[PDB]
Structure formats: structure tokens, C-alpha cells
Amino acid sequence: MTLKELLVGFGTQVRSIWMIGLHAFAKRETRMYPEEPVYLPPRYRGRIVLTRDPDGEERCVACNLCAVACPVGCISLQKAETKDGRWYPEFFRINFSRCIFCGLCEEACPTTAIQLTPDFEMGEYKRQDLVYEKEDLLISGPGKYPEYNFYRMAGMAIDGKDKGEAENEAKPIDVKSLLP
Amino acid sequence: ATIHVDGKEYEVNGADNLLEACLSLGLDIPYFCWHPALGSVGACRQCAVKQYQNAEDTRGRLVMSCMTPASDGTFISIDDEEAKQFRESVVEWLMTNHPHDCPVCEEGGNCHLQDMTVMTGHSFRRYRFTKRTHRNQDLGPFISHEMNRCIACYRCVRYYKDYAGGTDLGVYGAHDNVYFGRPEDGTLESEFSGNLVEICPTGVFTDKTHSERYNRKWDMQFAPSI
Amino acid sequence: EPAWQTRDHLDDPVIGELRNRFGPDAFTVQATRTGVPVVWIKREQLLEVGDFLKKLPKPYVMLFDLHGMDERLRTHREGLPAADFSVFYHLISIDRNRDIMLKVALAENDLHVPTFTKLFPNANWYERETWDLFGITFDGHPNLRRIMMPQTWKGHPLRKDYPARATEFSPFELTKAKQDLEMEALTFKPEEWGMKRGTNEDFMFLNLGPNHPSAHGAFRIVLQLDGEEIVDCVPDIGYHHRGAEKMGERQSWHSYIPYTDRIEYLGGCVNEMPYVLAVEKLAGITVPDRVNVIRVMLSELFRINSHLLYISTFIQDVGAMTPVFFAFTDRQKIYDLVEAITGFRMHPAWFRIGGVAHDLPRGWDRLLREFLDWMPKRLASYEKAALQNTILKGRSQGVAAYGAKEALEWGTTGAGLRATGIDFDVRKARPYSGYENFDFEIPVGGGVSDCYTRVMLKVEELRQSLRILEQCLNNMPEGPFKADHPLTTPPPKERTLQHIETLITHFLQVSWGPVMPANESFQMIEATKGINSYYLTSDGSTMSYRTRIRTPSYAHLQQIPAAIRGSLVSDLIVYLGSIDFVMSDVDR
Amino acid sequence: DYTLTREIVTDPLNVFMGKLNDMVNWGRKNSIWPYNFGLSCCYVEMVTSFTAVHDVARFGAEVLRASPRQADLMVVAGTCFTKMAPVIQRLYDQMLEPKWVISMGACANSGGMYDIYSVVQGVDKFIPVDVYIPGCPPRPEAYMQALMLLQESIGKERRPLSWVVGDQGVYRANMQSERERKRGERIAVTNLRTPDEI
Numbered sequence A: 001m002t003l004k005e006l007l008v009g010f011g012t013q014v015r016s017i018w019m020i021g022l023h024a025f026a027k028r029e030t031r032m033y034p035e036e037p038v039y040l041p042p043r044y045r046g047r048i049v050l051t052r053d054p055d056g057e058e059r060c061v062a063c064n065l066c067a068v069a070c071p072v073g074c075i076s077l078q079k080a081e082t083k084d085g086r087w088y089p090e091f092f093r094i095n096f097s098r099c100i101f102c103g104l105c106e107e108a109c110p111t112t113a114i115q116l117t118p119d120f121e122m123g124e125y126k127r128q129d130l131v132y133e134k135e136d137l138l139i140s141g142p143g144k145y146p147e148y149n150f151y152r153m154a155g156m157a158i159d160g161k162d163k164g165e166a167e168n169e170a171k172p173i174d175v176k177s178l179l180p
Numbered sequence B: 001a002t003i004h005v006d007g008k009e010y011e012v013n014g015a016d017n018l019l020e021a022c023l024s025l026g027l028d029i030p031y032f033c034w035h036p037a038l039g040s041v042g043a044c045r046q047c048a049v050k051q052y053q054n055a056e057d058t059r060g061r062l063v064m065s066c067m068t069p070a071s072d073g074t075f076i077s078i079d080d081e082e083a084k085q086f087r088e089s090v091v092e093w094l095m096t097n098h099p100h101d102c103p104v105c106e107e108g109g110n111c112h113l114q115d116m117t118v119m120t121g122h123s124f125r126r127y128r129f130t131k132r133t134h135r136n137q138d139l140g141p142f143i144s145h146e147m148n149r150c151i152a153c154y155r156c157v158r159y160y161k162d163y164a165g166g167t168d169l170g171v172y173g174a175h176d177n178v179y180f181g182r183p184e185d186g187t188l189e190s191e192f193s194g195n196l197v198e199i200c201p202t203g204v205f206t207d208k209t210h211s212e213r214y215n216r217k218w219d220m221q222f223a224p225s226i
Numbered sequence C: 001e002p003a004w005q006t007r008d009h010l011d012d013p014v015i016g017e018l019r020n021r022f023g024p025d026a027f028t029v030q031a032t033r034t035g036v037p038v039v040w041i042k043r044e045q046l047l048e049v050g051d052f053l054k055k056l057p058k059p060y061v062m063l064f065d066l067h068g069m070d071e072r073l074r075t076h077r078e079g080l081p082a083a084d085f086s087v088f089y090h091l092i093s094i095d096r097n098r099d100i101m102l103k104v105a106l107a108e109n110d111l112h113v114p115t116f117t118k119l120f121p122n123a124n125w126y127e128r129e130t131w132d133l134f135g136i137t138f139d140g141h142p143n144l145r146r147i148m149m150p151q152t153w154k155g156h157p158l159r160k161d162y163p164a165r166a167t168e169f170s171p172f173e174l175t176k177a178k179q180d181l182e183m184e185a186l187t188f189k190p191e192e193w194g195m196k197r198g199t200n201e202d203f204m205f206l207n208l209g210p211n212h213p214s215a216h217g218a219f220r221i222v223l224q225l226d227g228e229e230i231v232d233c234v235p236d237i238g239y240h241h242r243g244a245e246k247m248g249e250r251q252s253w254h255s256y257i258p259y260t261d262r263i264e265y266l267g268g269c270v271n272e273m274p275y276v277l278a279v280e281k282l283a284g285i286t287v288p289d290r291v292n293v294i295r296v297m298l299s300e301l302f303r304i305n306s307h308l309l310y311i312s313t314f315i316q317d318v319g320a321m322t323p324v325f326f327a328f329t330d331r332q333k334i335y336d337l338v339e340a341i342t343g344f345r346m347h348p349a350w351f352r353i354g355g356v357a358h359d360l361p362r363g364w365d366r367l368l369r370e371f372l373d374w375m376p377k378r379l380a381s382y383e384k385a386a387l388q389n390t391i392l393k394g395r396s397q398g399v400a401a402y403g404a405k406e407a408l409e410w411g412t413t414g415a416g417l418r419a420t421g422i423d424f425d426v427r428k429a430r431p432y433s434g435y436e437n438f439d440f441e442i443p444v445g446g447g448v449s450d451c452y453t454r455v456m457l458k459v460e461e462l463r464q465s466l467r468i469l470e471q472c473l474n475n476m477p478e479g480p481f482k483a484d485h486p487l488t489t490p491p492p493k494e495r496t497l498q499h500i501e502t503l504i505t506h507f508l509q510v511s512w513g514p515v516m517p518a519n520e521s522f523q524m525i526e527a528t529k530g531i532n533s534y535y536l537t538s539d540g541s542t543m544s545y546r547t548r549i550r551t552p553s554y555a556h557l558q559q560i561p562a563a564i565r566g567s568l569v570s571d572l573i574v575y576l577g578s579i580d581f582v583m584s585d586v587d588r
Numbered sequence D: 001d002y003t004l005t006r007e008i009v010t011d012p013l014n015v016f017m018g019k020l021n022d023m024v025n026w027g028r029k030n031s032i033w034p035y036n037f038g039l040s041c042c043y044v045e046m047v048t049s050f051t052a053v054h055d056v057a058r059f060g061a062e063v064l065r066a067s068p069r070q071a072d073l074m075v076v077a078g079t080c081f082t083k084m085a086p087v088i089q090r091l092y093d094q095m096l097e098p099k100w101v102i103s104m105g106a107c108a109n110s111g112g113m114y115d116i117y118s119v120v121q122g123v124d125k126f127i128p129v130d131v132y133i134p135g136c137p138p139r140p141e142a143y144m145q146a147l148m149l150l151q152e153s154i155g156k157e158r159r160p161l162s163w164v165v166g167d168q169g170v171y172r173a174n175m176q177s178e179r180e181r182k183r184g185e186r187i188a189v190t191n192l193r194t195p196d197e198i
């Protein structure tokens, strides 16, 4: 090979050594998990929870839209009803060994009950323990949507909210009323 | 008979009305008040098509396809702009008072009103006023009643009285306070009152025995049985 | 006239030339929303039509795509010839900036077409994949073996009667397959793989795979060797097959988007864009300007991410293991912005039919400004550290070089095609997603596509993507992040939460699926690793009747034997590092 | 509570071999070399954990041997394809005791979103798995958390010190699940930041 090529190669090797040393004399870019907590954005798609309304009841009306919107089919729930007539899930289970954390169920929820939270630490020893039942999902507060209540919009009458007491609803008028 | 829908010629039965003739051809016309077993009354005003007098005609006239016979040499249009606008407007008028109830309603995923709201293309609400509200009745152990979801399509009264011969279900009230149900709380006495859950295009009449353990139609495993 | 309008393209001069050459009754013109003329040709005239298109004054020089469709369950086939199966051939003329889709109709019993390899050599793998998934025999093929499934596989998976879901697992099948994996080295016959004169006895057979120590995926290459010289080689692919098209036939138009993410898993939103664009063509949706600029922003961010990873892996494959750490820190900056916007790192699933899942979060411009300030110094540092090094240049320059003819005949797109001197980028020739409103350059090569030329072209593409990101940050319209269409899936969330008609639309779109009317749509975009395309056939239902994903890594892996013939194994390693392919892109 | 492999048994642990067992488990858990096995996008996040922004080198899991003989942990990070499943099983058989398996991602856990004709529905169908990570992909810090979970899993398991003296069966602790352990603090969460900000 050419001697000029050898000199240029030696110069660029010296430059590589010097710039790697300068990188060594630079500041570290390491986020020290778990001593330094990982910053997650508020809309990060991690562990799935079920939330509650401002009134404290569970927000899920067991409408089965999240389960059908799931492209993996890892949501299973059954609808039950109380004496006053409100709908709730009898059970609600999610196979987290199957969930791809895509957020389509949160997007499909018409009550903002199911939510994906900034939490990624979900490792497990047995795959049977990755099936999260309703007691592992329902949290004590509203989560990312702090004030939405579906039952304040629904026309279906429940406890504490009679007919005509929802938003943008007039009081019921009997057909036997004297007014024309 | 010879009809021309959207410029395409079709051979139909002349004794049929235009709605059932066009639905038999695979064409899609929204409809609420008409049923194949109950006949045409022209109530819901949803099935509007635009009829022309002859082959060369640009004005036309919005006619009711369930109330219009499919005579020989008919000229109609379904995808006409005025017809589509009026069908979307009829859906919008029905949706002014409809309760925000689809998650907690047993007709969800099985609702003719949902299908025709989507099919007309109406998804934007400009109505800002209140919605009328109705109290419910106890109709017995089989039929669950929710009068808020009614669109006043008169299918229930027509089937139950004119077809099934029942005497305890009727229409009451007036202008926009029309109430479909029994004169008082009680069990529906007819032996064919269960067909109301399929006759009703909304969730007013629902299968209560199904409602006890409810699941949506897409979640069912079905079989053809006897 | 909108861009999604159904056109028969009878004003195309190719239709007039075909009518003058073959006659008015020789073919059937189909009106589609693909944007290209779709011409149904008789089977016995297929090679004549291909030759006539190849010898045009401005010829159709590249076979873009070749696959099949099961037409037995397609109810809406108005204006179409009677077909149980069909084979489609997508050909691109760069000189005309045009493309034509020929279609050949086959009956169920007579499932054989003449081979297309004498006109286009990429038809080898394309016809092998068509035979593997549809059972369509191509007469005259040199070796028509299964390319996606193993050789001992019964049935053809892309047929409509084949079950999509996974069969029950058996350890017996795994154990016997371990036995054939054991005797594959002993009972290797070069006649099975199309090689000839194997073991003269001066040739040895080398198997690189199945697991490579790299991030491009797992696959095998069998090499015929004389000492250290490669004379024949065929790649063994299909180890990353996920049935994405078959999944597209069993997911709704909305629920398939996360599957479009994992086609090229370094692409993300770049992979999401052609699918949602083709679905919006089916739906007749014209998205607003803010949607266009948001999608352009995310696509350029993910393009910079993929290019950084590619340059880092090429440098590491050369032998310098240092800059990959800093460039993964840069990828962490990009992932910070992408996590802020979409809520996820690698597979955002954020593009929607008619728009995007959410509006932009408050403060996105801050993270974008910090990233745009951070990038250029790091880029110059990586350049001076490795891409100007003489050892890397000696390892990369002149290795696996091909010209414009070889890139055209093998369907090579992206960095290689532009390194051959051909200026063809989809963002300029056939613009999409409002790319005409951005001022950026298309880097091209001198006329010979080395490893070094491709890597430097990717660096220039990263610079141009930074320019596009600067234009996105400076000029963003204020408006809707979703379209004003009834088929926007899902509708805006607040109107769903308080309006009942919007709740109905949301209910029926997320449960049964949005109803796309029966049409065929096609969207071709410039991906991070070449030219990507989605060809969607709808029968009027809530799912895709046919999803066809064309990926450039297939064409690059098929061009691997034609370019490395007569070189060394280290040249093969450098070439594999300098292609920018992922095995998910090849096998999908 | 322990489980045998040669059965649900109890803890069999004079005091010298107890300290020997703790020292052996400490040396095994503090020096775990993963096998470099690239399957799919989950391996891209694995090598993202391998870089300088996350520093998996702090746990002594950065040597990354290219031969299965020198590796102790197999991180199945990717889809378990039918063509690649014999390769996975052969590579697992090539590894030597002690060996542990971490499934990374929904594909390696259960098949994930790819319930399709050409995908094995989980790597536990043919090889045993020690740690499972949900995610698609799991983020690199989740992989490091799974590494810590494997570390405390190893730290109380019992293995023979020598091949000529003592019981040759392997003890694995029936650990309390992370779901029931974290349910006390996960349910108490009431408010999260609204998704309209950065």
C-alpha cells in the first residue's frame, strides 16, 4: 500500500484514540435504575388498572367494548347488575402474559374505566400469576381522568340519580298530564 | 316490473313496494317503521328515496320507498344528495332525545338504530338542548322496559295488536310524549310477547332472562337448533 | 377530484399502447382506488405483455410486486373476470413515474402460470412465496420450493380455507424436527436448494445461521465455497414468519394497526403510515393538514432512529464497538419524545384511520427543540470517529457493488437504488401525507452502490430528516387531529363521552369494526429501509379481504446472491451489515 | 416451601454447608452471563438495556457470551416461530447446569398478539421458564427488574455443591408472586397525571 495511505491511517487511528479518550473525559449518560426512578410520561402505556368515579363507585359498566377491541383477546368479563340497576363487572380478568400494551382497550372505553398507567415493573415467576383478576385491577381513585362520570350522562336510572337527573335531560312528563 | 335505481336497471316484482324490492336486490335503504311481516305504514320517514317522473328528469321528488309501489318503468335514486341529507336529518331528529345509554343497554351491538345511525353517516351532534325522559314499567319476568330509547316507530303496537292480537299494549300520549307500553304495570299477557325484543329496533323491549346473564352478540357462540 | 376517487385510468398512455399492440378485447381494465391502472390480462398473453412493457420507449423496468389472491370468497366482483385465484404483477416505470398492475385469473383446478423470472429475476422469490402460501404452480421456475414455511408443511396458509389460529403444540413434532435439524448437515443435497455440481470436490458448504449475533434477525445462508471464495449462495429465510397478512384477514380495519407496527420493528409509525393511508383511501377520507404534519414528524423521528441504529450496527460489524452506546443514548432521546407523544417506545400504535389517537401533549416542542439541538454534534462525532476512518473505508469501499441495471432488475429500493445514481424517492416522485410542503433534498450516489456509498447516503438522509423535523417544529397548523368523516376510527373521545350519535359510531367501530366499502386500495411510501407498500382489498366488510405488504428487505435479500458472487465471507458480513434489513421485514 | 427436580418439599437447611450454599448462590446470582440470542424486537430492547444509557453492566450481566456453553441464562426475547423452535430447544440443551430462562415479551410468554399458524404459543411449551416479563416490548428497565427477580430467586435456591457428595436434586423456592406482593401498594393508587401534558 501507499506510504501516504499508511500515514493517513495512523493519523486517523490517533484521532480515534484521542476522541475516545475525550468521550471518557465526558459526563455519564446513565440513568441508574433502580436507585434513580425512571421518568415515565403521563400517557405511558404500562400496567392496566380499573378506576373509580369521583363518587367512589367503580367506573366499569361491564359493556364489553374493551374485550372486543383487544386484538389479542386477553380481556374477559361478565356483566352483573345491582338492585338499583347499575351495571358492573361480576369478574374482570386480563391475561398480561398476552397483553401487548397497545392501549386499544383504554381508547375503546366509553366510561374511562380501563386505563394504562405509567408502571412497567410487572415481572413474574409463574405465568398463572400474570392473570390479573378484578381485585388486582380496581384502584381507589379516578386515575388519569379525574372527573368523568358516565352515569351522569346515561339515561338509565341508578341509585342516587333518578330519571331526568342526568345531564341535558328534562324531567319526565306523564301522558296523563293536563298540559297540552 | 322494470325499475332504475341510480341509473342501473333491475327487474323486480310489481306487487312489492320499493323498499322491499330494493332490499331484495341488495341495495341499502335505512328503515325503522317497516317490517316484512307487518307491512308499510310510512311512520318513521327514514326510507326516503328520490323518484323521477321519467328517464330525463333532474328535479325529482322525495318519495317514501316503503309507501311507493315498484311499478314498471320506475326511476328512483338512493344515493341522491337530497335523499341522503334527509335520511341523515331523520336519524338526527331521532337522536335528539336518545339517551346516552349504549354501554348499559342490552341492544348494544344488536341495535337497528345503531346500524342506521352509522349507515346514514350521522356522527356529529349539533343539538344542544335537553332530551325528553320517560319512566319505565314492569312488564313481567320476560320483557324489560326502557321507554327512553324509543324512536316512536310504532312497530311494537302494530305487531302486538294488529299481528299478534294482543290487547294490553298500546300507544298513549301525544306530540313528542308518545308512550308505548301497557296501561298499567303488569305482565304482558300475550303468548307471543317475546317477539317484541326483535320487533323493537331499539332497546325499549329487551330479553330480561338474557339480561340477567348478559353478553353481546359478537361474544355469542350460536348454533342452528330446533 | 379527490385523491381517493375511483379511477379506471383509461387516459394512461400504457392503456392505449396495449390496445394498439394486443387489441381492445385482449384485456379488461378495472376501476380501483389503487391509483395505478389495473389490467386483467389473459394467462397465455402474460409473457407477451411483460415483454411489450419491457421494450417500451420509456419501459417498465422494475417488477415491484408479485403475489396472489384467493378470490373464492369475494362476493363483490363486478366488472371482473371469473377467477377462483388471481396473480397480480405490479410493475414500475421510473422514467414515466408510473406503475401498472397486471392481473391473471386462474381457475381452481388449473393453478399454474408461466414463470416471470426470464423477464424479472425477483420473480424467483416472489413466485416461491406465491406457491408457498397459495399453492399456485409457476411453470419454468428453476426451483419452486417453500420459502416461508418448512418443506414438510401441509396446505397453503394464505388460502381462505386454511385456519389462521395456532394449532395445538406437540413435543413429538418438535423432537422429530430436532432430528431433521441434526441430520440437515449430513444429508444436505445441493439439488434441493437449486445449487449444482456440489461436492470436482473443490467446494465446501457453509451455514451461517440460524442465530446470528446481531439485531437484524435470525436466518441462514448456505454458501458454496472454494477456499474463502463464494461461488454460489442462497439465503434460507422464513424463520421470522408471523402470518401478518393472514392476521390482516382476521382483524378489523382498526385492530390491525399494532400488527402493522411489527412489520419493520425499527420503523414504527413509518410502518403505520401506508396502512392507514390505504384504509383512508378505502374510506374516502382526506385528513386535515395538522394530521399530515404530525404523521410526517413521527415518521421522520422514527426514520432517524432506524438510521442511527443501522449506522451503529454497521460500525459495530466493522469492529468499532464504542459509538453504538452514544447513538443508543440518542435513540433514548428520540424514545423520550416518542414516549411523550404516543405513550410507547418502539411500537406506538398511534396512527388512526382519519388521524391520530390523541392530540399532541402540551410541551412536545420543548422536547423536539432539545433533540434538534442535541443531534448534529453527535452526528459529526460519529462521522469523525468511524465513518471517516481508513480501516472502515477499506472494509466497506468496493464491497458488493452493483449498478443501476442490477438495482432495477432486482427491485432494490431506498439507499441502494439512489446510490446507483437513480433519483427515485416516493416522498418526491409520488408525494404522500403532505410531503410537498417540506423543503428537503434527496441524496443520490455516483452510479455504483458500495457499502460506503449506501452508509453515507443514509447519513445524508438523516440530515435531511433533521431538516424536515425542523420544518415540522417551526410550522405546525392549529386544528383537528382527526378528520371530519363518519368513518374516522375512533371518533374524537370527548364527543364520544358526551354525545350519543358519536357514542354509537364509537361503539360500532370498536366492536364490529368500521365498514369499508368494497374497493381495492394501494399506498406506496418511502420506508426507513427502502420502499414499503400496502395493498388492501376490501369486500365490503369490517375486516380486510386481502392485506398484501410489500417490503424492500425481501428484494435486498434476494439481491444478496447476485452481488456477492465471487467475493469473500468477510465481504458477505460487511454486505449484510450494510443492507439495513430486518428479518421481520423479509418474512412478515 | 421448595420444589424438587431430579415434588413439593420443605427447606432442608450444622452451619458450614449453609454458609457454603449462601456463598455459592451469591456468586451465581451476582455473576449471570446472558446468552446472545436474537429473535425479534424484544432482543432490540435487550441490547438497548445492554448500552450505556441503562447500564446492565452494573449487575455483572454484560459479558454476553456467543456460545451457549459459557452462558448461564437464556433470555428468550422474541417470537417463538415453528422453524426457530428446534433451534431454541437445541441451544437450550447446549447450555449447562445451572441454567435459568427469562421470557422477554408477550411473544415469548404466550405467543402474544401472534396467535397464528406459524408461531408457538409461548416458550414454556417446550423449555421451562424461570422469569416472565410482560410487555411488547418490555422496556430495558423492566428487563433489569426481571434480572433482579431472578437474582433473589437464585439467592435462596439450593443446589448440590459437588457431584460426588450430597443430594443431586435441585431445589427451587416457591416464591410469593409479585402480583399479590404489590397489590398492597398498587390498589392504593388514586390519582395519576392527566395525559394532556409532557
Ligand code: SF4
Binding pocket: A066, A069, A070, A071, A072, A073, A074, A075, A094, A098, A099, A100, A101, A102, A103, A104, A105, A106
Ligand atoms: S393494551 Fe391492547 S393488548 Fe393490552 S388488554 Fe388493552 S387492547 Fe388488549
Ligand code: SF4
Binding pocket: A059, A060, A061, A062, A063, A064, A065, A066, A067, A077, A105, A108, A109, A110, A111, A112, A113, A114, B103
Ligand atoms: S370498555 Fe370500559 S366500561 Fe366497557 S367493559 Fe371495558 S372497562 Fe368496562
Ligand code: SF4
Binding pocket: B098, B099, B100, B101, B102, B105, B106, B107, B108, B109, B111, B112, B113, B114, B149, B201, B202, B203, B204, C504
Ligand atoms: S337502543 Fe340502540 S342506540 Fe339506544 S342506547 Fe340501546 S344500543 Fe344505543
Ligand code: SF4
Binding pocket: B149, B150, B151, B152, B153, B154, B155, B156, B157, B180, B199, B200, B201, B202, B204, B205
Ligand atoms: S318501543 Fe320500540 S318498537 Fe315501539 S315505537 Fe318505540 S322503538 Fe318502535
Ligand code: SF4
Binding pocket: A100, C262, C265, D040, D041, D042, D043, D077, D078, D079, D104, D105, D106, D107, D108, D112, D135, D136, D137, D138
Ligand atoms: S412481544 Fe412484541 S416487541 Fe416482543 S418480539 Fe413480540 S412483537 Fe416484538
Ligand code: FES
Binding pocket: B019, B030, B031, B032, B033, B034, B041, B042, B043, B044, B045, B046, B047, B064, B065, B066, B067
Ligand atoms: S320505513 Fe318507510 S317511512 Fe318508515
